[PDB]
Design a protein around this ligand. Structure first.
Ligand SMILES: Cc1cc2nc3c(=O)[nH]c(=O)nc-3n(C[C@H](O)[C@H](O)[C@H](O)COP(=O)(O)OP(=O)(O)OC[C@H]3O[C@@H](n4cnc5c(N)ncnc54)[C@H](O)[C@@H]3O)c2cc1C
Ligand code: FES
Ligand code: FES
Lengths: 1292, 99, 50, 50
């Protein structure tokens, strides 16, 4: 009966009889046609959908701005609020906001998909702090992820707002004018002033929605429907609605109630309302801790500590304090702190008040200590701490912030009257069970003792017995979680014993001098310096200048149309998939009865509904689209649901009942695949290795496992397929790298010639090799459904769907046997490569692995073999580097292992085995490593290595629980394809009679700025400004037979083709230009038309020569080589497992950089993307082959907190390639292994100090789980281990 | 091409020109329409010479393509048009041309 | 280079779809750009002959 | 199945444009009243020469 009223970008939005299940993000895109707000992960952890919510409090007569993730906001909770998006703060046709101008001109945009989320977070903070500090801007960006830029240029644009040769002119930016910001909608200000007390009712055939605005009415609705939840920020029940299958028919969402948002400063403590956001709570707590004595602000400091690492700024501004308490998440960062300090909950019912204490039985949800279903939570009381009362909190996750904790804790102790006896003790642990638990029995048996090491050792063995984790505990990391429970107890014993030493120095002893570092927290500060070249060239020649990405400001204003950003075409249908839920089973039955009858369902297709066109051959062996009778991995396509809307599609997909029968064997690991026919072998040999194994001093055998990786492109798999209605013509609009492949698989599926199926790609929001084979499979069945029903079909996958259907990087296993002498030189090296290929096969990864395994080391006697292994996991795809980040790591791991057996640092072993200036590769190709040795020497001097190596050794000898590490690796990245026909590129250039030029080519813009570089080529070869040239996109209707747009040579090859078409046109026009050199380009093209001169031309480059005889093992497959070196420094926490990237120094040989701004961004992004591959990015698989994606098992990519605090990049000064340039987008990924060995060196320093000589086999990724378990101590051997065969683990 | 189909069957005559100059059935050739994004600076499609003039331009592009493919056609005169275009791609022969 | 024109087929023209058609397309694209929406203009027979 | 120009599917949020034409063969425009027409349902904009 009620209406919905709110504002978006100043325009009024009225909605009559709304579906209460409607979320803000799909409403902005599908109903308001505001495609700037993007979809990233749907869980609220990416920040791609960041918007600004604005409310007016009529009591304070002030407006409150706060950011929020639109993908979790129901629109019924926005009554009277004003939403602001990217399009609202500015656009190209009106005024560009300085936030949009600076984040784009600082080259902080590559693919540009995450940019709208970055812009809104920066804009919202500048609306709350017009003169901010960099600390405030980085904390706002803590909830925003990016896969391309590495966060460095976004920080540079943020520094522009602070009153604290370059790639951008900061002096030309608009000063942030605070006078002409967006005014708050005055209609809402009048609405709030009239405190209407009527509750609003929104309903549909599925759900009713009640928004009481008075406390009296709210208590009435909570009594009518006790089971109905009380939605506040929707950050706990929202995510459960999507992926956890929960559904609530009744929903209560109170508006701003004055009784629910109370903050009072009492005498015994403070009481905070349950309606306050966690961001507001930290603001009143950060205010009181600098106003009150430190003896009473003990509890609030522990809360402020974890509220700083509590998710991101958007989720903190949505989640409520009461919602956090009632949610009772097992991995809660705030419940263990509140449980140990006698907190009470002010419950209010319709019958009367009630006050229960927040204790153990409440968090365990015992009904006696819980809330009655009729009463709400109004406020919580947090008392002041007393003298000689001390409380501390701890946590540990995959990264420092915006990551669910593996194990966190809160501990409070009380002595009283100033003597070292404990009178009260209360400790709690989270992430160790289904609910937050307190060791009430352990704290009981310890009351009365003194603070000392003799008590602590009995406190451990007592706690370890009480809080027990079975070997099969969910979340995995059981041996890691057992240690974090002890280590937090050790850090707590160290902290409060230091507080006693500061207050009563005479009675208590001073702590151990080598133990003080354990109390310091690894907290960041972000500095960056970039060096590159910058006379005798025309000033209108744009080659070599840091030109901004053409779609840069379009990325910043949301006007950049991505695939799903395309307007909904008439009568289009949505297609969702149901995927396999077993890793290896037989499909015994598929029940489509209930799903076919559901609303909106048009058709559901299984394997039999495709008949003969269920298989396409990728020129090795045919792979099937939909599963037939068996499934071979989880996430394999089984059915395709086709419905009128996206929502109705997934609903029917969840009602498809599929029965299975598991099969044997269930192959998961590499070795499990090696146990079971014939496998195509590949090998290269140099010299004789068997003869060298008898003339070397030592022989070292070793191996290293390496985990996989997810592409995690910010734009998930998206495509729209539109039949024309004539001659079965079909236009596909796909986010892909290989439009020709999409054209082939769709034409083959539809049994049509290629000339009837065209493929159009304007831009892709990141790809990294993950948008080819699986994307064509989805487009095949999507076009099949489109042609069958004569309608346009759109298929966009969610994040959870995407990671499960798409593969990723190939997990590697490298066995090696190295013959070497004591001087560090390696003579004999036998190598075996193994790649976890997945369900289907992959040879090219093994090939490029063996050819690039040598890196910058001349192995005189080398034998290298490789294989690919079928497993019951999703089939992986080629990534950045094409196997190089794996083949070069196992050699560096080998070099590090012989350095331990030789006693020399790994850096000395690397330089001893390095190539000479002129040398020969294992495949008998000569190299000129003159730039290779020069990169190593300048990186040593630029980073001041030896001065920092001795300082790190000084730190390791002075500190016991904190260690530092330092490492430097060289880089030789060979660039080349298989044959000349694979490097072939084409282009098409038009010149209109007004002088303007339209160019198109076979390359795909994925963020590497290929289009920007092509316009730079047109500008030089035709002597016209780029403003005269324009490019729309890539289409098979213009440039046929285009090669895949993946790798380093995409811009190089297409740059030569565009250069060929411009020269062809320029030669036809030479008579006209010579006879009138003063005239413009307009009268040149006009007289060309008058003289019958053709102004259209095709560009073409046949490709670089490339050959390789894989039988002999010799060949010339690489056009050029990219050289470089990287040096990284790390400080690790020995107790927790935490680490901090301190400094990284990168030098690269790019030659003549065609665009130094774009090329440096690719170096940073490749390094950060590689850094995550070796440190934090971890894929958790179950023993049944099911990928875990909820809780501490969540996949995490590098954030801002993970970027090194100091980053230095220098481009080595400088002809077969275009303009003497070098493609380099895949090089820096391996340079991200410098931090891996920096952590490896620091772990060695902790093992050497404690005397633990032996095999330090650290596998990739070097997660905090592997870091801490390598630093063995008394707590390591104290944990209760489990026997291997008793329990079925949660992971591995 | 730059011609506009107004009922004079200009498109039909062009496919007849492709069929003769490339020695392939019309079923192999297809045309979608006219667009300034493909053929720039096209003249007005009105009068008697619309098909004649555009027929000579389509004939010029087919001859340009047929000459690039003469080494491949002579070395395999029995093969179809599919393996001709495939080996042209393998030998780095440009299969697009402007008439 | 920013304005492209696409014509698949015309149901008869005879010279009457040039100068006046461009005038209609001029003001139709002007209205389309001003309001940021797609605009369709189809004349009735009586409108057309006039 | 031959798609002509107006046979193209209605694109999202598209607007329609109609013209008012002269009713005199040679006269002077003394006034143009767009008041009543601008307020009518569905009207987005009315453009004159200025
Ligand atoms: C991306 C993301 C990252 C996160 N990271 C972390 C982290 O790092 N550490 C951590 O500890 N947590 C984390 N969380 C969880 C988050 O802290 C909680 O979900 C949040 O605090 C709950 O508050 P809410 O407003 O969303 O409650 P809601 O989602 O609105 O509701 C949840 C439950 O609480 C009930 N409820 C709400 N208010 C009341 C009230 N007055 N009275 C009675 N019942 C009420 C509701 O009935 C409902 O049943 C994260 C969540 C997301 C989405
Ligand atoms: S953060 Fe809202 S979509 Fe990922
Ligand atoms: S996500 Fe920022 S550009 Fe790819």
């Amino acid at each position: 009966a009620s209406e919905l009223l709110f504002y978006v970008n100043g325009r009024k939005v009225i909605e009559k009889n709304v579906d209460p299940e409607t979320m803000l993000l799909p409403y902005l895109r599908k109903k308001l046609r505001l495609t700037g707000t993007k979809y990233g992960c749907g869980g609220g952890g990416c920040g791609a959908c960041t918007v600004m919510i604005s409310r007016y409090n009529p009591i304070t007569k002030r407006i409150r701005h706060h950011p929020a993730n639109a993908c979790l906001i129901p629109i019924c909770s926005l009554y009277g609020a004003a939403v602001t998006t990217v399009e609202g703060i500015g656009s190209t046709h009106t005024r560009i906001h300085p936030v949009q101008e600076r984040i784009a001109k600082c080259h902080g945009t590559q693919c540009g998909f995450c940019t709208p989320g970055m812009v809104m977070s920066i804009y919202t903070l500048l609306r709350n702090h017009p003169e901010p500090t960099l600390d405030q801007l980085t904390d706002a960006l803590g909830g925003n992820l990016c896969r391309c830029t590495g966060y460095r240029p976004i920080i540079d644009a943020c520094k522009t707002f602070c009153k604290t040769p370059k790639l951008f002119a900061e002096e030309e930016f608009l000063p942030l004018d605070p006078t002409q910001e967006l005014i708050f909608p005055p209609e809402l200000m009048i609405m709030a002033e009239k405190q209407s007390q009527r509750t609003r009712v929104f309903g549909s055939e599925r759900m009713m929605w009640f928004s009481p605005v008075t406390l009296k009415e709210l208590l009435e609705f909570k009594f009518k429907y006790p089971q109905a939840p009380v939605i506040m920020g929707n950050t706990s029940v929202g995510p459960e609605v999507k992926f956890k299958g929960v559904f609530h028919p009744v929903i209560i969402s109170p508006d701003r109630i004055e009784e629910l948002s109370v903050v009072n400063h009492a005498y015994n403590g403070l009481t905070l309302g349950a309606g306050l956001s966690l961001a507001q709570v930290k603001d009143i707590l950060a205010d009181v801790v600098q106003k009150l004595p430190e003896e009473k602000t003990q509890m609030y400091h522990a809360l402020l500590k974890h509220l700083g690492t509590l998710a991101g700024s958007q989720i903190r501004n949505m989640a409520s304090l009461g919602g956090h308490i009632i949610s009772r998440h097992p991995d809660s960062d705030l419940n263990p702190i509140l449980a140990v300090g006698n907190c009470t909950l002010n419950l209010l019912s319709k019958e009367g008040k009630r006050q229960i204490p927040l204790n153990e039985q409440f968090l365990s949800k015992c009904p006696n200590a819980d809330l009655k279903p009729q009463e709400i939570l109004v406020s919580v009381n947090i008392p002041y701490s007393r003298k000689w009362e001390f409380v501390s909190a701890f946590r540990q996750a995959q990264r420092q912030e915006n990551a669910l904790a593996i194990v966190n804790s809160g501990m409070r102790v009380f002595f009283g009257e100033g003597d070292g006896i404990i009178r009260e003790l209360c400790i709690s642990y989270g992430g160790v069970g289904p609910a937050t638990i307190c060791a009430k029995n352990s704290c009981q048996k310890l009351i009365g003792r003194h603070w000392n090491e003799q008590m602590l050792d009995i406190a451990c063995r007592l706690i370890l017995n009480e809080v027990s984790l079975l070997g099969s505990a969910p979340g995995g990391k059981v041996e890691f979680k057992r240690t974090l429970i002890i280590s937090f107890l050790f850090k707590f014993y160290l902290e409060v014993s230091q507080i006693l030493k500061k207050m009563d120095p005479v009675h208590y002893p001073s702590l151990a001098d080598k133990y003080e570092s354990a109390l310091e927290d690894l907290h960041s500060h972000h500095c960056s310096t970039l060096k590159y070249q910058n006379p005798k060239q025309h000033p209108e020649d744009p080659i070599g200048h840091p030109i901004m990405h053409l779609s840069g400001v379009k990325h910043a204003t949301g006007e950049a149309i991505y695939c799903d950003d395309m307007p909904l075409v008439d009568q289009e249908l949505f297609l969702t998939f149901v995927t396999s839920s077993r890793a290896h089973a037989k499909i015994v039955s598929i029940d489509l009865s209930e799903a076919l009858s559901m609303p909106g369902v048009v058709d559901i297709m299984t394997a039999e509904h495709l008949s003969d066109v269920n298989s396409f051959c990728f020129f090795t062996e045919a792979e099937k689209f939909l599963a037939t009778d068996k499934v071979f991995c989880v996430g394999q396509l089984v059915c395709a649901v086709l419905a009128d809307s996206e929502v109705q599609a997934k609903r029917a997909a969840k009602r498809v009942k599929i029965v299975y029968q598991d099969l044997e064997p269930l192959i998961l690991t590499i070795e499990e695949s090696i146990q079971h026919s014939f496998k195509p072998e590949r090998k290269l040999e140099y010299g004789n290795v068997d003869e060298a194994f008898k003339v070397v001093d030592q022989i070292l055998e070793g191996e290293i496992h390496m985990g996989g990786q997810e592409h995690f492109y910010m734009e998930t798999q998206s495509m729209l397929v539109v039949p024309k209605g004539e001659d079965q013509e079909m236009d596909v609009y796909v986010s892909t790298q290989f439009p020709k492949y999409i054209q082939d698989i769709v034409a083959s599926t539809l049994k049509l010639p290629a000339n009837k199926v065209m493929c159009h790609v304007r831009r892709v929001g990141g790809a990294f090799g993950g948008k080819v084979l699986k994307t064509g499979i989805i487009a095949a069945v999507t076009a099949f459904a489109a042609n069958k029903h004569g309608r346009a079909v759109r298929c966009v996958l969610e994040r959870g769907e995407d990671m499960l259907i798409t593969g990723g990087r190939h997990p590697y296993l490298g066995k090696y046997k190295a013959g070497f002498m004591n001087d560090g030189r390696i003579l004999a090296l036998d190598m075996e490569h193994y790649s976890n290929a997945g369900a289907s096969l992959s040879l090219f990864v093994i090939e490029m692995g063996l050819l690039k395994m040598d890196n910058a080391y001349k192995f005189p006697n080398l034998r290298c073999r490789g294989w690919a292994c079928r497993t019951n996991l999703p089939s992986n795809t080629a990534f950045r580097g094409f196997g190089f980040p794996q083949a070069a790591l196992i050699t560096e791991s080998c070099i590090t292992e012989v350095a331990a057996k030789c006693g020399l640092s790994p850096e000395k072993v690397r330089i001893i085995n390095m190539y000479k200036e002129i040398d020969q590769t294992p495949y008998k190709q000569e190299i000129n490593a003159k730039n290779l040795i020069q990169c190593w020497r300048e990186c040593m001097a630029m980073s001041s290595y030896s001065l920092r190596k001795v300082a790190v050794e000084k730190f390791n000898a002075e500190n016991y629980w904190k260690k530092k590490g330092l490492a430097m690796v060289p880089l030789k990245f060979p660039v080349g394809l298989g044959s000349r026909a694979a490097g072939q590129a084409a282009a098409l250039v038009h010149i209109y009679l007004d002088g303007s030029v339209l160019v198109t080519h076979g390359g795909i813009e994925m963020g590497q700025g290929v289009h920007t570089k092509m316009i730079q080529v047109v500008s030089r070869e035709l002597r016209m400004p780029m403003s005269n040239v324009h490019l729309r996109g890539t289409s098979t209707e213009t440039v046929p037979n285009a090669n895949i747009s993946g790798g380093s040579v995409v811009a190089d090859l297409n740059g030569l083709a565009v250069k060929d078409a411009c020269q062809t046109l320029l030669k036809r026009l030479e008579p006209i230009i010579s006879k009138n050199p003063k005239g413009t380009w307009k009268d040149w093209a006009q007289t060309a038309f008058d003289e019958s001169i053709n102004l259209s031309a095709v560009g073409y480059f046949r490709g670089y020569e490339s050959d390789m005889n894989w039988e002999k093992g010799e060949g010339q497959p690489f056009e050029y080589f990219v050289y470089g070196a990287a040096c990284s420094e790390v400080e690790i926490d020995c107790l927790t497992g935490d680490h901090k990237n301190i400094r990284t120094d990168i030098v690269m040989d790019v030659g003549c950089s065609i665009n130094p701004a774009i090329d440096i961004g690719q170096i940073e992004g490749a390094f950060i993307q590689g850094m995550g591959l070796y440190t934090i990015e971890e894929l958790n698989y179950s023993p049944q082959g099911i990928l875990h994606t909820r809780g501490p098992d969540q996949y995490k990519i590098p954030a801002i907190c993970d970027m090194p605090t100091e980053l230095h990049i220098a481009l080595l000064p400088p002809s077969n390639t275009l303009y003497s340039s070098k493609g380099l987008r895949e090089s820096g990924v391996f340079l991200g292994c410098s931090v891996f060995f920096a952590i490896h060196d620091a772990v060695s320093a902790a093992r050497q100090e404690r005397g633990l000589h032996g095999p330090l086999t650290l596998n990739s990724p070097l997660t905090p789980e592997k870091i801490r378990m390598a630093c063995e101590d008394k707590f390591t051997k104290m944990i209760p281990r489990d026997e291997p065969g008793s329990y079925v683990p949660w992971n591995v």
